[PDB]
Amino acid sequence: ESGVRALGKNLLSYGRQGYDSIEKIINRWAPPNENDTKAYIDSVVAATGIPATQSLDLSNQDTLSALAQAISFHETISPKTPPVSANVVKNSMVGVAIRAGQTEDSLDVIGDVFNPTRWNNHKWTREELDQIRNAGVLPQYYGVITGGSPQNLTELINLALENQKLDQEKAKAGTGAQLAAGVIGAGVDPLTYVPIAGQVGKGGKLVNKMFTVAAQSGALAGVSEMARTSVAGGDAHVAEAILGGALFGGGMTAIADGLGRALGRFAGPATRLEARETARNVDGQDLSRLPIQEGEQTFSHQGVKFADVPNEPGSVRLEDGSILIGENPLNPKTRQVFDEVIEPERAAAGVNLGGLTEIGLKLLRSENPEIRGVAADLVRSPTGMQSGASGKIGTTASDVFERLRAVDHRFYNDIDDAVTEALKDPYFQTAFWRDSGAFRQDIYQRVSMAIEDGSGNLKAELTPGELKVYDLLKNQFDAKREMMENPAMFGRPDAQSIFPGSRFKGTYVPHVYSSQMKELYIKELGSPEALQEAIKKSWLTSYASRPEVKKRVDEALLEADPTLTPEGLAAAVDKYANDKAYGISHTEQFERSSVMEENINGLVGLENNSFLEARNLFDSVNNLREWDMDKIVPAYNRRVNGDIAIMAGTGKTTKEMKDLVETLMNKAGDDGKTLRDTLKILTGRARRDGADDAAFATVMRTMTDLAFFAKNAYMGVQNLTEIGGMLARGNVRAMLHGVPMFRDLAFRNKKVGASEIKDLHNVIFGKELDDSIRPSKQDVIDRLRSYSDLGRGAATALGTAKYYTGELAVRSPFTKVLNGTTNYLLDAGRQGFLSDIVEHSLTGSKRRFDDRWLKTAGISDEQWKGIKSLIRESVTRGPDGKYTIKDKKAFSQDQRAMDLWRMGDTIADETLLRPHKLSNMDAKAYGPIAKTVLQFKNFVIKSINGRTMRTFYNATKNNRAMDAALSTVMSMGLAGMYYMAQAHIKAYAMQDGRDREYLKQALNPTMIGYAALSRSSHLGGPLGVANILGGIAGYEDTKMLRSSVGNFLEQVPAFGYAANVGATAYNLAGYLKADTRVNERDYMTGMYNTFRELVPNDPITQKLLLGTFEEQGIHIKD
């Protein structure tokens, strides 16, 4: 505070007496009959946001501290009354010009445009949502409805319907159909074209008249009736994604030409892309090829040939004359230069996977009969192909492993599209009082709870978009258990069962328990025992309530114990429940850390399968579970597949195959002459760090065969990747001109010295420290954000009534209006402040630390002492300037880590995100990340105040598009910054003058663009590229088997694989009789899924980005 502190109390009393608006307070403050009070009202409405007549709520800090500051200014060297600080001849006309201006208070951009204090907080009921659903409004018109009051529903519905009707008529007129004819040559004006919403599924394509003969493309079959059309998933969406890409490219070329011509000094890729698409759509000549002549130099990398291109450095030509820009993910030269000179530590050897084939071939060449006896069963020798000496018995481990691994990736590719579609129901789009990141966890929790219910009333509550997810998950979870109960379905008739407990029926969903919640409950109840008895009683209640639980427990108990006593049940039930409770309240075997631990050095955990002793007979305990399936399903799948394969191939449990290794090695004392590696790769325990690089390498290596046996997929893949590269290049060009720190780091010539390396290494250490500690659950985050509010101020009425732990409105309006964009900035600031805290704790400095932080955050003495002691205990800093942590698993399992994380988060949020306006910021000093965050925020604020965004918001009240458009630029710039910092750190150690050449090679803008696109979080979403595109390894695995003819193939069973109804291809029947080869559909679907949010199938986002870049300008180089 340190200011005012009197108008605050005055306004508190005024609001207690019952004054509503600005007019009443001001009129009491200054009577209207003495002095104006007309220009004294506008100066307050303009600098705060709230209009004059509108009501107030003086119980909110955002509406209290804002109004106090806008009054004291008007009551009361300095060149022209400067509000901001430093840290953040007169005859002709000059005398009149300066002497006449008057200073006024600064504007508030957020309040003026959106006005978020008029939004009501009402939770709609079921009938009030069914009315909206029955009315028939499209998903893009929910902007009008949200925030309204229960009294005015019908008028809002009428308004939405009227807007829909007007847009339908305009689309019938044929207004937004000029984009099909292209941009290059004759067509639309790229910077003067406004699209219409609602024509997503009509079905269009690109055909340019400048590259075809009129006989080849005859004419148009009219136009759609506009009342019947529909589209499928991915076969007719690529043709519109590319339509959006064309508009973006044309706009960028138009901007660059004007800048260049004005100053006096994006034209190849656009032309090449349009030529390719026109040639693809009408089956004509491809005019965008440049073949290799004779007598010209050529190279090769990983079996792929290429040659340079003249007049365009950084590009390359393939064998058939297809040109790829230097920023593509499939460029053979950029990966070569990386692996050669820039990043040798992550060499291709460090990211290479060969598969079971080469290991099998090496293993089969042995002399020891004991090893060969099991080798003949583990792997499938290539000496067959109608000539195999043996191996006829049936399936070995390899076959079952390949089949299951082939079906799972299709399952993932379908669950992604199923889930993504569910988040457009009116239930989720109209709730602005919750974070936008927890929707997926909400869906998974609700569905999983509904599955295990037996009554059925919970199933009746799900929305029409969750039933498909229900069906998919139920079917697969049943099929896996059905396989595990009878492993003789594959061909070996002497295999037993591995499922523990198989008498009764049900659906099993994996159980994984958290640890932070355990620590919080232990703190509140005071002892580890109280948790044990709470768990025991919450288990015992279900026995008494339900009959089926009683039957199951009684039958199992009587089978277990031959002695029968009617009195013995009251002891048997308790002596069975007690140890089960103790197994959770007094150890850490079932926690997430041990079960899902990243890397192991050898075979350490194969003795016991921790996923399957979480099962119980019983049926609150649900408060200690985790509902994040996107990370839990694949690991379960990998472990189970390994167990099934070993058991159905050999006839021995995994424990036996494990101890056989040591039994053999006990006789290996003598220096005589890979079973371990085979078992490790089969179980699913090999290191999988950086699998995305391998995923792209696979496609890069097998592209030619695809080009041979299919054509449309080839050109589709090419166009998608090129659009991605062009977007990355444009973003880097804009960011160079925008943000000063980017420019400072990108324009160096030699090695930096002395001071700056310490800051450059704190930047690196912050990310690791934040990643190792962040909670993995939502409720823990809510409670940790809740304590800090109670650490400053609240009342009894706040605890009662609504309030609720769900909290987004209590925050600033900046979070409400644009929620997706804020998380990146917050997550940067948190990592920023954590390193400063650590540095002060070690070295005892005072240049950054401030003692008001303890009072602002809400930390007492004991917590601070504990934090300081722990940091001093567990971390050391070297004279070089590098931080190291001695222990990692134990460090992240203490109560104090939560205190440290909470302090960092609250300080960062309160200091950087709360205070609006640039004249309201007070701070002692700013660090290396605070400047970056401030400059990015300044960029955003400039963007919102433009003309294009204001006109778009006025036309349609849709605020969901702006957040999606503006998240990408943050996602990419932040990705680039750490690459630059890492390069500067690495180049410091070269003693000779080689640093100049190294920096010349490393800091080219195209390399920055490549590393920005490959990194970041486009991936495939939460699932990942390693999972979405990881299914094409089968083609390589099957090629190398025979090479190191035939394959006439049995006739496909009459029921082909083209026709398979969804959600019924995944039960037990669908696994055993499917087709497990690769076709073009896999290529197209995986490639479209990987690039979904960057290149959508609507053109509004591209138009918004184009307008912003027009208004602000880009760096022209040269």
């Binding site: 007129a173 067509g187 008249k209 590259f211």
Partner: protein, 187 residues
């Protein structure tokens, strides 16, 4: 090109000097047609596209993007002033072909490969100086094909500044008026 919002006046101007109409008759023709408006749908954003994508109309098919604004207005004015829907597609072509310049390929077949305007080619202030830029461009194209004996496998064109470019994006040239004038004076 500078003021493309009142192109009907230019249509009025052209016939008073090229054909020989006196103003009184065209004054009377507008007043007589005030009562009845044709408006048989027609004028919209749909009729224009399906009229501009027909191989029959050889001149309207190709059009610089800087001349769409006035062509529509000339077409609308003629359709309003008369009744024919096929005598309004011909006067537009006459106006367009009298304001622009066309280039052709060297083979036996004479498909057009470009279209530009007669002020991007002027060299001086003499109002008949547009006949030099055409010769310079022709010589440049003919001397550039011979330098690279593979351009014939793609499409060399003259796209409206005025550029020379392939279908591969590798070859790109720009035409600067001031340099041409400065060199021509010395020569």
């Amino acid at each position: 090109a500078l003021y493309p919002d009142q192109a009907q006046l230019f249509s009025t101007f052209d016939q008073m000097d090229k054909i020989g109409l006196d103003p009184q008759t065209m004054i009377e023709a507008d007043k007589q047609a005030a009562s009845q408006s044709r408006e048989m749908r027609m004028e919209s954003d749909k009729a224009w596209q399906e009229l501009k994508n027909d191989s029959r109309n050889k001149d309207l098919s190709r059009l610089p993007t800087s001349l769409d604004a006035s062509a529509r207005k000339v077409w609308d004015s003629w359709y309003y002033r008369t009744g024919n829907a096929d005598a309004a597609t011909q006067q537009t072509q006459r106006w367009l072909n009298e304001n622009t310049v066309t280039f052709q390929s060297e083979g036996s077949d004479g498909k057009s490969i470009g279209m530009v305007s007669k002020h991007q080619l002027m060299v001086g202030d003499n109002p008949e100086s547009w006949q030099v830029g055409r010769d310079i461009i022709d010589t440049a194209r003919k001397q550039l094909i011979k330098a690279n004996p593979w351009v014939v496998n793609s499409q060399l064109s003259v796209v409206e500044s005025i550029f020379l470019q392939d279908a591969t994006g590798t070859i790109r040239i720009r035409y600067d008026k001031e340099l041409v004038g400065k060199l021509y004076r010395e020569q």
